Design a protein around this nucleic acid. Structure first.
Lengths: 209, 56
RNA sequence: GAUGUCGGCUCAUCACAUCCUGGGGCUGAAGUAGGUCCCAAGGGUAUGGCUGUUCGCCAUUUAAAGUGGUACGCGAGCUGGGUUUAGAACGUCGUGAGACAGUUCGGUCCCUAUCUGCCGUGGGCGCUGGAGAACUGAGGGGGGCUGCUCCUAGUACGAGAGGACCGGAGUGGACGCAUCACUGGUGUUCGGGUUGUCAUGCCAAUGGCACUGCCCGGUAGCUAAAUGCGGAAGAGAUAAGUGCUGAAAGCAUCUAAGCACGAAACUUGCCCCGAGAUGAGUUCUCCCUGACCCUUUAAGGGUCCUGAAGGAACGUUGAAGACGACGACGUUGAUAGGCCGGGUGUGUAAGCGCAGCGAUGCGUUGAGCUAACCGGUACUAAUGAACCGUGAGGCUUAACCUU
RNA sequence: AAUUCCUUGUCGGGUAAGUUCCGACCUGCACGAAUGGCGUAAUGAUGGCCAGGCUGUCUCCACCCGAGACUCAGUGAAAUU
RNA sequence: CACAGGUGGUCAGGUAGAGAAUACCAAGGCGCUUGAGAGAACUCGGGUGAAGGAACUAGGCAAAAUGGUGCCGUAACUUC
RNA sequence: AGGACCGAACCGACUAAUGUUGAAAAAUUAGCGGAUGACUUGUGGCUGGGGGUGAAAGGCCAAUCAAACCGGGAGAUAGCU
């Protein structure tokens, strides 16, 4: 079914009465307001566009304000779309709370991974480090060979090399839903999720099931 | 390590297409002193936002 | 008028004559376990002792430790033990200088990347008025491994010994992604102990230097050994193979018409990129509703007025970052620093008093100090402006306003 | 064997496993007595081998401190073609 | 070359120290003739490291480690 | 007493890294050897090219050595590019 947009508050632990410590990531899921409903007739597919949080009225551009005004909802920090599974009906301006995850038991969490910047092959691709001694000359962490001889006189596409690492969309699948606190708009999921504290997270019911 | 052919003057100009300098869009004017200055920088006479910062 | 070699290291990529896993026929296939052939290249496919070795033998693992191509892949990527200079010996040959594809000890491995290629990241213009967002998904990548235990069941099978198919459950190895709550590492920006010496007039107390002087701890961050998750199920069309009905050929026949099954391969399903997809797409929202002149009179040029949406620039900056970029904020403000409170770390500061001849001990006192952390706070800096971007957006045709 | 081609000779020692090493054997391809033979304490930046200690050499790399690399201003090369 | 090289003699303070070693200083002399930022890969020179401890490798290369004075004690072998 | 021992100056150059269009046409850094002697060093002198000198490597003889350098024979010769 549809998902929700939340914020990564941080990580903590839940102590069970049986003596087990569950590592949980706290996700703040405020009410998600439906800003637009897309249908086959007009958009060619079924989905709902939602917003969450609050944004400075001084920093909301007029094109954005008009979009929010049409839906009759307060502006949020962004817009996200969720596809509808042929059985979901929503109306513009509807508020979706964290109670939607009451009986899900497993969710998929998507976020932007921490940015590692320009990373070497050792860190990025787990390349094996060459000898630190035994005559090695300025080639301790270098990639090594990157191809074959004249026959393929070129480096193949997709070759694992150094470059930007992290700061990209990442999804972690099948995370247990430890707790759903509707009063505090909190969602506790066992384990870690991508992104740093305060980053946006997209939570959907597990697709693998 | 070194070129096999001499690059052309056309190639040299193509590489330098990104070397052009950018001029300051505009200069701020002090409200009281009235002289031009870089934005968020003090004027040549020691003024800033019409406060007459140290000018010794 | 130079295409550097054996082996090792790093990094690979393809073939299938398949080592493992998967699907099958036959069996001198009871079962378990095998033999042989067919299909199958998705993924996976040991560490050590000896030796320069590849190889090989050996030790011990594994579901398996596949065979080959790639300048016997890979030295403008590393190595230099071997081959293959000059030194020096042994055996051997020669009268001798010397020699051996015999041995033995020793013996300089350069290159700042122009182009192609590849990994990343921007600028320009385009997409036909401009602008801010959210998308569709043509297409392209990633991923695809598997053990053991238990139940079914000591059942089928078998004289016994032994011991399943099918199906289900749990828990691991290797690998991959993310993360820092826990366990830890680091923590020359925090605290303390301590040696030598110099200095602050001296005592006391501190600071400099000696690898952070040497050390003991340790915040945030980063991080693995730490802890979460992943490989799938399902669907479509099939390979080998198994069939149903059924003639040619009164029979038979899986095939010729027709119909049904069938694998980690194929197309999907999962994850990521993605409209420069010039075939430049879709949706929502926002902004601009002047006056004249010239003429070679048209998608023409020029002047005056106008300058929107928005953008950029500058500033404060970020768990974003080589630089660009990207994100937050700029007084109608918590963006950064400072400040306040707290936490954390270190471990009872200084001063004074007491006890002691003294080194020290004790009280004040879990004191003082405390980075990047948490919660707050306009004290400082984020200035009014200026700048870019315009003024309703071509032609043809069709249906509607004027079904 | 600094000498042995066959050859990683055979046996023993050391190791879970030893083409090296050590001790014997003698079938010395092709040792041998001043181009010396065999021993030899001490000595050696000498060759080979085995242990204790020690460790980032390695399993398997992580973090940190500095100098470059990166950006800005000034100066301003080279091989090659 | 205003070049991390080479170049004989003389002078020889303080504290610690066996010392002309070494550390910190006196007299005296210098900061080495591009700077300013940033805090990526990678290279160079260093610091620390969980568990293991030569499994690395041609080879313990490199690194780590040992390190002073006094007393006790000290094997095979030996040319004593 | 000692071509004795440890270890600075001094004289050497065993290992590694760096550098290799270097700071340097052989050095730097961390270790390393000798360090009263067959030691080291200043100044001056002598030995000359088929010659010198050589604790012997074909080493050294002005960054040149299986026959130095400079000038000359000389436009050696080149069935080769």
């Amino acid at each position: 079914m549809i998902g929700l947009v939340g914020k990564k508050v941080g990580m903590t632990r839940i102590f069970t009465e049986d003596g087990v410590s569950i590592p949980v990531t706290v996700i703040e899921v405020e009410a998600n307001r439906v800003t637009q409903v897309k249908d086959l007739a007009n958009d060619g597919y079924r989905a709902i566009q939602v917003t969450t949080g609050a944004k400075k009225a001084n920093r909301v551009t007029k094109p954005e304000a008009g979009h929010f005004a049409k839906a009759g909802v307060e502006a949020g920090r962004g817009l996200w779309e969720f596809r509808l599974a042929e059985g979901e009906e929503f109306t513009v301006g509807q508020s979706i709370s964290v109670e939607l995850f009451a009986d899900v038991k497993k969710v998929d969490v998507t976020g932007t991974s921490k940015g590692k910047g320009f990373a070497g092959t050792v860190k990025r691709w787990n390349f094996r480090t060459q000898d630190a001694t035994h005559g090695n000359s300025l080639s301790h962490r270098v990639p090594g060979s990157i191809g074959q001889n004249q026959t393929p006189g070129k480096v193949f596409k997709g070759k694992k090399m150094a470059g930007q690492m992290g700061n990209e969309r990442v999804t972690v699948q099948s995370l247990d839903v430890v707790r759903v606190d509707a009063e505090r708009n909190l969602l506790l999921v066992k384990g870690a999720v991508p992104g740093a504290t305060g980053s946006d997270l997209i939570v959907k019911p597990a697709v693998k099931a | 390590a070194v070129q096999q052919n001499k690059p052309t003057r056309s190639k040299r100009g193509m590489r330098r297409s990104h070397d052009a300098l950018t001029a300051v869009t505009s200069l701020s004017v002090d409200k009281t002193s009235g002289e031009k200055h870089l934005r968020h920088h003090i004027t040549a006479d020691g003024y800033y936002r019409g406060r007459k910062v140290i000018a010794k």
